[PDB]
Amino acid sequence: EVDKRREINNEHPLLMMPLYANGEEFNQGKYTFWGGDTLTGKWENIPDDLKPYTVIQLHPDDLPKRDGAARDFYEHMLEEAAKYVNPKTGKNEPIPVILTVYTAGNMPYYTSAHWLSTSWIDKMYQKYPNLHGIFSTASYWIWANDIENKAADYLKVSAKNGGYFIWAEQNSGSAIEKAFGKNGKIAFQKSVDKYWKNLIFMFKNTPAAEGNDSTTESYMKGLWLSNHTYQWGGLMDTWKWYETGKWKLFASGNIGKSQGDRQWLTEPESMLGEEALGVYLNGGVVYNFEHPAYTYGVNNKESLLFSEVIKEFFRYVIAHPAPSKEKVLEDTKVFIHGDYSNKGNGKFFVNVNTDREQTPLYMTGRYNVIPAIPGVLKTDKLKESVSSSRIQIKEITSPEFSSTQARKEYLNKLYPMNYEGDIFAQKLDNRWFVYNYKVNENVKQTGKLKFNSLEMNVEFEPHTYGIFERISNGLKVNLNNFRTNKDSLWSNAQDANQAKKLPQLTKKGAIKWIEEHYIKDTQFGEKRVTKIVLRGIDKLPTIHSLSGTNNSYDQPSLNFDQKNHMVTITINSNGNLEFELHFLEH
Numbered sequence: 001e002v003d004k005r006r007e008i009n010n011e012h013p014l015l016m017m018p019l020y021a022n023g024e025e026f027n028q029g030k031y032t033f034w035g036g037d038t039l040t041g042k043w044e045n046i047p048d049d050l051k052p053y054t055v056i057q058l059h060p061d062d063l064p065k066r067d068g069a070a071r072d073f074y075e076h077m078l079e080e081a082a083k084y085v086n087p088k089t090g091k092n093e094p095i096p097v098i099l100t101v102y103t104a105g106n107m108p109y110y111t112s113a114h115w116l117s118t119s120w121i122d123k124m125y126q127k128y129p130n131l132h133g134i135f136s137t138a139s140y141w142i143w144a145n146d147i148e149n150k151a152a153d154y155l156k157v158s159a160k161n162g163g164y165f166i167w168a169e170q171n172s173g174s175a176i177e178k179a180f181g182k183n184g185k186i187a188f189q190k191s192v193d194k195y196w197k198n199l200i201f202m203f204k205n206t207p208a209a210e211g212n213d214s215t216t217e218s219y220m221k222g223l224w225l226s227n228h229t230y231q232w233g234g235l236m237d238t239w240k241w242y243e244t245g246k247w248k249l250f251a252s253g254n255i256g257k258s259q260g261d262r263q264w265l266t267e268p269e270s271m272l273g274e275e276a277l278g279v280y281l282n283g284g285v286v287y288n289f290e291h292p293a294y295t296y297g298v299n300n301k302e303s304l305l306f307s308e309v310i311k312e313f314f315r316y317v318i319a320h321p322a323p324s325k326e327k328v329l330e331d332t333k334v335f336i337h338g339d340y341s342n343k344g345n346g347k348f349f350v351n352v353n354t355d356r357e358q359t360p361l362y363m364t365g366r367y368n369v370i371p372a373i374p375g376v377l378k379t380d381k382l383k384e385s386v387s388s389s390r391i392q393i394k395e396i397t398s399p400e401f402s403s404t405q406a407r408k409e410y411l412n413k414l415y416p417m418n419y420e421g422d423i424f425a426q427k428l429d430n431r432w433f434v435y436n437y438k439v440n441e442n443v444k445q446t447g448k449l450k451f452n453s454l455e456m457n458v459e460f461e462p463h464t465y466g467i468f469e470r471i472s473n474g475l476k477v478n479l480n481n482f483r484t485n486k487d488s489l490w491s492n493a494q495d496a497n498q499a500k501k502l503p504q505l506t507k508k509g510a511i512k513w514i515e516e517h518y519i520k521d522t523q524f525g526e527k528r529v530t531k532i533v534l535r536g537i538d539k540l541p542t543i544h545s546l547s548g549t550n551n552s553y554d555q556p557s558l559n560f561d562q563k564n565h566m567v568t569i570t571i572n573s574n575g576n577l578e579f580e581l582h583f584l585e586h
């Protein structure tokens with residue numbers, strides 16, 4: 001083994017920072033990115049505490065589809081990255097980079113990436129110590145003839161150089177199963193046997209109308225636990241709103257895939273944190289997002305979605321490392337072996353732990369994410385682990401998995417009910433993680449959680465998550481319900497028929513909208529109410545270390561009921577929020 005160029009694990013998670021090449025400007029002789037970020041400017045803006053855990057991911061987007069274009073653009077940017085000087089210290093501090101080398105099956109009618117040879121990749125790895133990895137993304141919809149053969153070469157060239165091959169894919173058309181050899185293309189399967197320690201496999205939740213979120217995430221977790229990948233994670237994509245045909249928040253009717261650039265702006269900001277929790281809580285450590293202009297920012301400035309949700313969530317997973325592989329293994333009661341493509345794909349988990357076919361969220365944390373691997377793989381390395389002796393490994397074709405009812409009856413016997421209420425909640429150590437799982441319906445949810453004898457009841461509106469940690473002196477609270485008002489994008493349309501017919505915002509139009517109406521002059525959402533009730537409390541709790549999104553919260557209200565040893569906490573806010581409550585139990 002060659003020394004790894006960087007660590008990627010629970011203590012060293014990874015936030016990929018995408019920069020998409022502007023092909024139109026490249027034709028004019030300029031080296032720029034859609035949305036106006038610059039490589040140096042973006043890197044500089046990244047908070048210093050995050051720099052060790054973030055990597056610039058270059059993407060060739062609409063560069064000319066012919067030989068030389070992607071090489072030219074990439075070499076220019078690798079040179080900029082390599083030569084970077086920190087203006088504070090005057091020292092050359094090479095910017096870490098990942099190159100997108102494969103996308104859309106590398107078809108010459110789809111991407112300039114077609115003309116990036118494995119030879120050239122090897123050359124860049126050898127020239128640039130700051131090239132930490134290469135990235136393949138979104139070929140599920142165009143599963144090219146030699147995709148597995150090329151993936152094998154990408155993994156091997158990365159291992160040769162101590163870099164990572166990172167592959168983001170969704171299980172549409174059995175993609176994950178095919179990648180590992182379901183249909184007889186076994187080159188990547190064999191490559192993985194040798195080189196898995198240099199592989200990161202991620203979901204890509206874009207094609208949301210096909211409902212493969214839960215099954216793909218289950219595979220990513222299972223591949224990791226079974227040593228088919230070094231780590232895992234997810235690319236969470238606001239374009240899911242477009243794929244599923246949604247429009248104005250909470251509105252009636254479906255507009256189909258008709259208003260792309262309005263649609264990728266509309267997903268509630270806090271809902272990205274809800275999606276990301278599914279990665280974190282299940283031991284994933286790699287995060288990436290689209291659309292980049294909304295999820296990260298423009299013009300070397302952080303979008304509010306980035307500043308108030310993603311940055312804060314990512315800081316949380318650095319401060320509180322995800323459960324280790326050993327820990328997740330010890331917690332796993334059931335491990336599925338087989339092809340979800342043969343068992344309804346995403347439907348497998350509907351009314352088990354998802355509330356509908358088309359969602360990136362879960363309705364219960366009772367089973368967390370049940371890990372799986374495709375039928376083509378073996379569970380040999382899984383069973384060899386010291387930590388896997390108590391797992392029931394089950395074929396997906398087992399009677400226990402034959403129907404929705406059978407799945408719950410089987411799982412319920414192994415995963416006890418550990419909270420009450422129709423809401424998402426999952427517990428790790430002394431922390432309850434809670435969210436409202438409604439996607440596009442304005443419905444409050446309630447749950448009853450316990451820390452031993454201490455009872456905590458919560459009431460959450462949609463697009464609200466909380467993390468509640470029992471500390472020696474009380475409770476630490478992290479709350480995020482940040483959701484700005486996107487109604488202006490859907491102006492002039494009273495119903496779905498009118499919305500579908502709106503003039504296209506366009507890619508350039510949406511970038512402009514971000515600049516003029518999101519980065520500044522933001523239409524903030526209304527403050528909304530969260531209730532927390534604690535029962536089993538000695539005296540009126542005190543509040544400490546209160547902070548959150550500027551101008552986004554009223555002072556929390558505490559109402560202590562002496563006779564009933566309980567407090568009702570009422571919060572009115574729209575943003576991220578943090579505080580401690582100090583109290584003793586009664």
Ligand SMILES: CC(=O)N[C@@H]1[C@@H](O)[C@H](O[C@@H]2O[C@H](CO)[C@H](O)[C@H](O[C@H]3O[C@H](CO)[C@H](O)[C@H](O)[C@H]3NC(C)=O)[C@H]2O[C@@H]2O[C@@H](C)[C@@H](O)[C@@H](O)[C@@H]2O)[C@@H](CO)O[C@H]1O
Binds near residue numbers: 141206
């Ligand atoms: C031939 C064809 O139409 N192929 C489609 C894929 O490109 C789709 O992939 C992504 O889908 C999104 C819609 O759900 C969207 O089209 C996205 O590209 C757009 O957004 C990115 C940033 O998020 C860039 O700005 C692109 O320039 C822009 N393109 C357009 C036409 O508006 C697609 O993602 C990009 O392309 C894929 C191939 C990868 O390279 C990604 O990394 C890129 O971000 C796919 C969705 O399921 O559907 C296919 O039909």
